[PDB]
Design an enzyme around this catalytic site. Structure first.
Site, PDB file in Angstrom:
ATOM      1  N   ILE A   5      -3.031  16.227   9.039  1.00 15.78           N
ATOM      2  CA  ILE A   5      -1.674  16.180   8.506  1.00 15.78           C
ATOM      3  C   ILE A   5      -1.723  16.653   7.062  1.00 15.78           C
ATOM      4  CG2 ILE A   5       0.360  14.768   8.079  1.00 15.78           C
ATOM      5  CD1 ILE A   5      -2.287  13.338  10.334  1.00 15.78           C
ATOM      6  N   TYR A  76      -7.181   2.983   7.084  1.00 10.97           N
ATOM      7  CA  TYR A  76      -7.747   2.977   5.745  1.00 10.97           C
ATOM      8  C   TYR A  76      -8.605   4.215   5.514  1.00 10.97           C
ATOM      9  CZ  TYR A  76      -8.770   0.569   1.369  1.00 10.97           C
ATOM     10  OH  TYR A  76      -8.826   0.199   0.044  1.00 10.97           O
ATOM     11  N   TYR A 119     -10.281  -3.211  -2.619  1.00 15.30           N
ATOM     12  CA  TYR A 119      -9.699  -3.083  -3.951  1.00 15.30           C
ATOM     13  C   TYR A 119     -10.533  -3.798  -5.006  1.00 15.30           C
ATOM     14  CZ  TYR A 119      -5.378  -1.112  -2.033  1.00 15.30           C
ATOM     15  OH  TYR A 119      -4.449  -0.305  -1.418  1.00 15.30           O
ATOM     16  N   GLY A 138       3.404  12.298  -9.654  1.00 18.11           N
ATOM     17  CA  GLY A 138       2.541  12.636 -10.762  1.00 18.11           C
ATOM     18  C   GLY A 138       1.117  12.147 -10.588  1.00 18.11           C
ATOM     19  N   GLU A 173      -1.357   2.617   2.639  1.00 17.34           N
ATOM     20  CA  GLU A 173      -0.448   1.482   2.521  1.00 17.34           C
ATOM     21  C   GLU A 173       1.006   1.870   2.758  1.00 17.34           C
ATOM     22  OE1 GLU A 173      -1.974  -1.260   2.364  1.00 17.34           O
ATOM     23  OE2 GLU A 173      -3.513  -1.361   0.804  1.00 17.34           O
ATOM     24  N   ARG A 176       1.338   1.864   6.556  1.00 18.33           N
ATOM     25  CA  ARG A 176       1.370   0.499   7.066  1.00 18.33           C
ATOM     26  C   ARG A 176       2.731  -0.141   6.833  1.00 18.33           C
ATOM     27  NH1 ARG A 176      -4.403  -1.661   4.479  1.00 18.33           N
ATOM     28  NH2 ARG A 176      -5.787  -0.559   5.934  1.00 18.33           N
ATOM     29  N   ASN A 191      11.912  11.301 -10.103  1.00 24.21           N
ATOM     30  CA  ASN A 191      10.675  11.795 -10.718  1.00 24.21           C
ATOM     31  C   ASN A 191      10.082  10.788 -11.702  1.00 24.21           C
ATOM     32  OD1 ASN A 191       8.581  13.617 -11.050  1.00 24.21           O
ATOM     33  ND2 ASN A 191       9.644  14.810 -12.630  1.00 24.21           N
ATOM     34  N   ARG A 192      10.084   9.518 -11.316  1.00 25.12           N
ATOM     35  CA  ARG A 192       9.512   8.459 -12.134  1.00 25.12           C
ATOM     36  C   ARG A 192       8.157   8.049 -11.571  1.00 25.12           C
ATOM     37  NH1 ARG A 192      12.888   2.940 -13.164  1.00 25.12           N
ATOM     38  NH2 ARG A 192      14.211   4.446 -14.270  1.00 25.12           N
TER      39      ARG A 192
END
Ligand code: NDG
EC number: 3.2.2.22
Lengths: 260, 205, 212, 261
Positions: A5, A76, A119, A138, A173, A176, A191-192
C-alpha cells in the site's frame, strides 16, 4: 510478492490519507471475523507466511522512499527497508524470528536491532515521550528522511527512534483506531502538527486490554472496566463496547467465538 | 299561593354558548323575581334581583329580563365553573322558588380510565368480600358497567354511584362495587369489570 | 365577610323533634331577617318561614304551621328552627338565608352550608374501613383507593394524608341499602411515591376516625 | 482458544439516564421493576448480574416479564418459579434488551421517575434503549464531522460550525438510551421525523422518547437512526446550508462523524 500500500506526503490531503488507512485495513483482515461490529485481525496460530505480513511504502517529497513491514496479526511495524538495506526490531520469540527471515529477500544486508518495537524502549532511545513528539503530515515527511538516510549513517539514533514513533502512530495506530485516524485527519487539514493528547496515548496503551474486554464480553458487557483519558486526561471508566464501536477499527485475535 | 313554573328542568350546552331559563308565574309578581346558583355542597348564590339588576360581584355574562308574569335568565360565554342548579324565586308576595334547572357543560367525548381492586385481606377477616371498579373522567355520563366472574355475568349485589360533573374538565366519574360473601368469593377465580369495544381492567387470584 | 354557620347533620328517630341552629358572624344580627328553606333530593327548594330577630315577627308557609317553630337568640347571633314530630318526609337538607328587608327590592342574600336532617329508626353504626391496594398499573401515575362500607348515618369525610393532596381525589356519593350507607374514594398520585399514602375516614356520628 | 463470557455485576441505565431498579427494594415474586435515579452505593436493587444463561439477576431473583404480549409489565421473580423463557433476555449491541420468546423489548413507556417497566413491540425507540454500565453520567463530547467542523445547536436547529472548544453549544451528552442530547439543555434530544430522505434533523424535547430520537454510533463512522435505517447527513456536503438531513448510507465524508472525548 507481498501486498503493498503506497502513500505520499507530497500532496497529502484528507481524502488521500483516508483512502490510505482504509486500504491498509482491507489488506490486514478479511473482515469475516467481526465481534460486536468491530473487525478482528487473523489469529497468529495457523497463518501461512504468504499471508503473515503486508508492506507499507512511504514516499515523501524530494524523491525519498521507504518501505515498512507490518505484521497481520497485530498491525504493528516489524521493520523497514531503504534501497538495499533492511532493519528489523528484536523479536520477542524464536518463532517470529523465522517469519522475519522471509521479509525483504532482495536486500544485500539484514540488520536486527538490539531493541524491540514497544514504546517504552523507543521513547527512551528517542529521548522524548510520545506526549512531546509532534505528529501530522510534517513529522511524517521528516521521518521518511530519517529512515532512508539512516543506512548511510546520516541520521542520529534518537531521531530514528522518534521517527519510528511517528510512523507507528500515524499508520499502525491509525489503522487500529479510526479515532486516531480522525486525529491525524484533523492535522492534515489545517496543516497543523501537534503532539498527541492523553486521549490518544491512553488508547494506544489499551489496545491489548480493549480487544480482550470486547472479545471476552458477555453480550458486550465488560468483566472489569478499562480506564481511558480525554483531552484533559481527567479519565473515565468504560464498562461496555457500545461507546468503543466508533473508536476501535481493528482488534487483535484473542479467542474464537462460541458456537451460537 | 303564587306558583312559579321554571322551564326547562335540565339543560346541556357547550363552553362559550349562551343558555336561557324561563320562569312563568301564576300572577303578576311586578318584576320582583330573583335568580340563584346552587352548587352541590355549597349554599345557593344570589345572581340577580328585581328581574335584571345583577348582583355586585357577578360577571356581566349573566343577565335577566321580563315583566308581569314572564321572565327569563341568560348565561352567555359559558365556563366550566358555571355547573350548578339554577332557581327563580319571586318575592312580590311572601316567597316561591322555581322548580330548578340543572346545567351540564358539553365537552368532547372521553373514555373512562378503569381501575379494579381486589378485596382487602382485612375485609376477608370480617366474612365479606367486595371488589371495586372505578370509571374516572369520562364523557358523556351514560355508561354501562358489566361485572364478570369466571366469564359469567353477575347482576345481583351491585351498587353504582355517579359523581356530579367536574367544574374544571367537565368530566364525570363512577364507582361500581360488587358485594359477595367470602366463601362465594373464593369459590371462583378470575374477576373482571367491563365498561360500555368495552374497556377491561382485571386482576387474577 | 358574612357567614351563616349552620349546625351539623342531625339524626333523629321518627316522632322526635330536632332544633337547627344558624350563627351569624358578619353583620348585625338583629337588623336582618333569617329565612328557612327546605330542600329534598327530589323537590327543589321549599320556603318554610322567616323570623325577624329584634322583633318577634314570624311568617309561616301554612304548610309547616304545625311542624316548624322559629326562635332567636340575639345574645349569641343564632337563629333556630325546631321541626317537631318528624315524619320520613321531613328527611331533607335545610338552609338558613339572610334577607335584608330594609326595602322590598331585596331578596335572600347569603346562605348557610346547610344542615342534613335524617329521620330514620336505624341505629348509628361505624364504618368498616378497608384499603384498596393496587405493579401492573401505568398511565404515568398510580391510583389507590379506600372503601367505607357499612355505616349509618351520613356523612363521612374522606381525606388523604390529612388534607393533601386533592388533585387528585374522587370521592363518590354514598349509596343507601335501607338503611346502611357505603361509599368509595380513590386518589391519583405520581408514579414515584410508594412516599407514603393513607386515607383518613371520619364518621362524626359514631366518633370513629380510622387511619388505614 | 475459546472465549468464556463472564457474569459482571453491572447496572442498567436507560431512558432519561435512569437506572433499572427494583421498586422500593422489595424482592417478592411479582413486584415490578421501575425507572429510578442511579444510586452511588451498593444497594442490590439496581445492581444486576449478567448471568451466562441469558438471565439478568439482582440479589438472586430474576428479571422476568409478566407475559409475552405488549405491553405487560416486567417484574422481579424467582428464577425457578417463573417460566424458564420468561426470564431469558438478549442484550444487543444497539442497546436492545429483548425477550426471545415474545420477541418484545424492555421498554420505559414514560420518562418520569418510578415508571414501571414493560415489554413492547421493537420500534428501536428511546424508551427501548438500554446500556449495561456502572457509569451514572452520560458521555459528554463534541461531535466532529465534515471538514473537521463541530456539530452545534442553538435551542432549535442543529448544524456544523468551526470547532471552537469554547462554545459549549458543540457539547453533546450521549445518553444511555441512545439519545444525543445537548449539554446545555439535557431535556432536549437530537430528533428526526417521518423517516424520509432529506429530513432536516431538529432539536426537540425528549418527552415522546420516540424512534427518531435514538441514535447509534457505528464502526464506519456514521450516526445511525436504527428504526429508519438512515444516517446523519450534511446536506449536499454544504455546511453553509445549516441543515443536517437524514439520508441513506453511502460512507461519503458528509456522513462520517467522530466523538472527540
Ligand atoms: C494499494 C496500492 O495503491 N498499491 C499499489 C500497487 O498495486 C502497485 O503495484 C505499486 C506500483 O507503483 O504501487 C502501489
Amino acid at each position: 510478492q507481498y501486498p503493498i500500500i503506497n502513500f505520499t506526503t507530497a500532496g497529502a490531503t484528507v481524502q488521500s490519507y483516508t483512502n490510505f488507512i482504509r486500504a491498509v485495513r482491507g489488506r490486514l483482515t478479511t473482515g469475516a471475523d467481526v465481534r460486536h461490529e468491530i473487525p478482528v485481525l487473523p489469529n497468529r496460530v495457523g497463518l501461512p507466511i504468504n499471508q503473515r505480513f503486508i508492506l507499507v511504502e512511504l514516499s515523501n517529497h524530494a524523491e525519498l522512499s521507504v518501505t515498512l513491514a507490518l505484521d497481520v496479526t497485530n498491525a504493528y511495524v516489524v521493520g523497514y527497508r531503504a534501497g538495499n538495506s533492511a532493519y528489523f526490531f528484536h523479536p520477542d520469540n524464536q518463532e517470529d524470528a523465522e517469519a522475519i527471515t522471509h521479509l525483504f529477500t532482495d536486500v544485500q544486508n539484514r540488520y536486527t536491532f538490539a531493541f524491540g518495537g514497544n514504546y517504552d524502549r523507543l521513547e527512551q532511545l528517542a529521548g522524548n515521550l510520545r506526549e512531546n513528539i509532534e505528529l501530522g503530515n510534517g513529522p511524517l515527511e521528516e521521518a521518511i528522511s530519517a529512515l532512508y538516510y539512516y543506512s548511510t549513517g546520516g541520521t542520529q539514533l534518537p531521531t530514528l527512534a522518534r521517527s519510528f514513533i511517528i510512523c507507528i502512530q500515524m499508520i499502525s495506530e491509525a489503522a487500529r483506531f479510526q479515532y486516531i485516524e480522525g486525529e491525524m485527519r484533523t492535522r492534515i487539514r489545517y496543516n497543523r502538527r501537534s503532539a498527541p493528547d492523553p486521549s490518544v496515548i491512553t488508547l494506544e496503551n489499551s489496545w491489548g486490554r480493549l480487544s480482550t474486554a470486547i472479545q471476552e464480553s458477555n453480550q458486550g458487557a465488560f468483566a472489569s472496566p478499562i480506564q481511558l483519558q480525554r483531552r484533559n486526561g481527567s479519565k473515565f471508566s468504560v464498562y461496555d463496547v457500545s461507546i468503543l464501536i466508533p473508536i476501535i477499527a481493528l482488534m487483535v485475535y484473542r479467542c474464537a467465538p462460541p458456537p451460537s | 299561593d303564587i306558583v312559579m313554573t321554571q322551564s326547562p328542568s335540565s339543560l346541556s350546552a357547550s363552553l362559550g354558548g349562551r343558555v336561557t331559563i324561563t320562569c312563568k308565574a301564576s300572577q303578576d309578581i311586578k318584576k320582583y323575581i330573583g335568580w340563584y346558583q346552587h352548587r352541590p355542597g355549597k349554599g345557593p348564590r344570589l345572581l340577580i334581583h328585581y328581574t335584571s339588576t345583577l348582583q355586585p360581584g357577578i360577571p356581566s355574562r349573566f343577565s335577566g329580563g321580563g315583566s308581569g308574569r314572564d321572565y327569563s335568565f341568560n348565561i352567555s360565554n359559558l365556563e366550566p365553573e358555571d355547573i350548578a342548579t339554577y332557581y327563580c324565586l319571586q318575592y312580590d308576595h311572601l316567597w316561591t322558588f322555581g322548580g330548578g334547572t340543572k346545567l351540564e357543560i358539553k365537552r368532547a367525548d372521553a373514555a373512562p380510565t378503569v381501575s379494579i381492586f381486589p378485596p382487602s385481606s382485612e375485609q376477608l377477616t370480617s366474612g365479606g368480600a367486595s371488589v371495586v371498579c372505578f370509571l374516572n373522567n369520562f364523557y358523556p355520563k351514560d355508561i354501562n358497567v358489566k361485572w364478570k366472574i369466571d366469564g359469567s355475568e353477575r347482576q345481583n349485589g351491585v351498587l353504582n354511584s355517579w359523581t356530579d360533573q367536574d367544574s374544571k374538565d367537565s368530566t364525570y366519574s363512577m364507582s361500581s362495587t360488587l358485594t359477595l360473601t367470602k366463601d362465594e368469593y373464593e369459590r371462583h377465580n378470575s374477576y373482571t369489570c367491563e365498561a360500555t369495544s368495552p374497556i377491561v381492567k382485571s386482576f387474577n387470584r | 365577610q358574612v357567614q351563616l354557620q349552620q349546625s351539623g347533620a342531625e339524626l333523629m328517630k321518627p316522632g322526635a323533634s330536632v332544633k337547627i341552629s344558624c350563627k351569624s358572624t358578619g353583620y348585625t344580627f338583629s337588623s336582618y331577617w333569617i329565612e328557612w328553606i327546605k330542600q329534598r333530593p327530589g323537590h327543589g327548594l321549599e320556603w318554610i318561614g322567616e323570623i325577624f330577630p329584634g322583633s318577634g315577627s314570624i311568617n309561616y308557609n301554612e304548610k309547616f304551621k304545625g311542624k316548624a317553630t322559629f326562635t332567636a337568640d340575639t345574645s349569641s347571633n343564632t337563629a333556630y328552627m325546631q321541626l317537631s314530630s318528624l315524619t320520613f318526609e321531613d328527611s331533607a337538607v335545610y338552609y338558613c338565608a339572610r334577607w335584608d328587608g330594609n326595602d322590598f327590592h331585596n331578596t335572600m342574600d347569603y346562605w348557610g352550608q346547610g344542615t342534613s336532617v335524617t329521620v330514620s329508626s336505624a341505629k348509628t353504626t361505624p364504618p368498616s374501613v378497608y384499603p384498596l391496594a393496587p405493579a401492573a398499573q401505568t398511565n404515568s401515575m398510580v391510583t389507590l383507593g379506600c372503601l367505607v362500607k357499612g355505616y349509618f348515618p351520613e356523612p363521612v369525610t374522606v381525606t388523604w394524608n390529612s388534607g393533601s393532596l386533592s388533585s387528585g381525589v374522587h370521592t363518590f356519593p354514598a349509596v343507601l341499602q335501607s338503611d346502611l350507607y357505603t361509599l368509595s374514594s380513590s386518589v391519583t398520585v405520581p408514579s414515584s411515591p410508594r412516599e407514603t399514602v393513607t386515607c383518613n375516614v371520619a364518621h362524626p356520628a359514631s366518633s370513629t376516625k380510622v387511619d388505614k | 482458544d475459546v472465549c468464556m463470557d463472564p457474569e459482571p455485576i453491572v447496572r442498567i441505565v436507560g431512558r432519561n439516564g435512569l437506572c433499572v431498579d427494583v421498586r422500593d427494594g422489595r424482592f417478592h415474586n411479582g413486584n415490578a421493576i421501575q425507572l429510578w435515579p442511579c444510586k452511588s452505593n451498593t444497594d442490590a436493587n439496581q445492581l444486576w448480574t449478567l448471568k451466562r444463561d441469558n438471565t439478568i439477576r439482582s440479589n438472586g431473583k430474576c428479571l422476568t416479564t409478566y407475559g409475552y404480549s405488549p405491553g405487560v409489565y416486567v417484574m422481579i421473580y424467582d428464577c425457578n418459579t417463573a417460566a424458564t423463557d420468561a426470564t431469558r433476555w438478549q442484550i444487543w449491541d444497539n442497546g436492545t434488551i429483548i425477550n426471545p420468546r415474545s420477541s418484545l423489548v424492555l421498554a420505559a413507556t414514560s420518562g418520569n421517575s418510578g415508571t414501571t417497566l414493560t415489554v413492547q413491540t421493537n420500534i428501536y425507540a428511546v424508551s427501548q434503549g438500554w446500556l449495561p454500565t456502572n457509569n451514572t453520567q452520560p458521555f459528554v463530547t463534541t461531535i466532529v464531522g465534515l471538514y473537521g467542523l463541530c456539530l452545534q445547536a442553538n435551542s432549535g436547529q442543529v448544524w456544523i460550525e468551526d470547532c471552537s472548544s469554547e462554545k459549549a453549544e458543540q457539547q453533546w451528552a450521549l445518553y444511555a438510551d441512545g439519545s444525543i442530547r445537548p449539554q446545555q439543555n439535557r431535556d432536549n434530544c437530537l430528533t428526526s421525523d417521518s423517516n424520509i430522505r432529506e429530513t432536516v434533523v431538529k432539536i426537540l424535547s425528549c418527552g415522546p422518547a420516540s424512534s427518531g430520537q435514538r441514535w447509534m454510533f457505528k464502526n464506519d463512522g456514521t450516526i445511525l437512526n436504527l428504526y429508519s435505517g438512515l444516517v446523519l447527513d450534511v446536506r449536499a456536503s454544504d455546511p453553509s446550508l445549516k441543515q443536517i438531513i437524514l439520508y441513506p448510507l453511502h460512507g461519503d465524508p458528509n456522513q462520517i462523524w467522530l466523538p472527540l472525548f
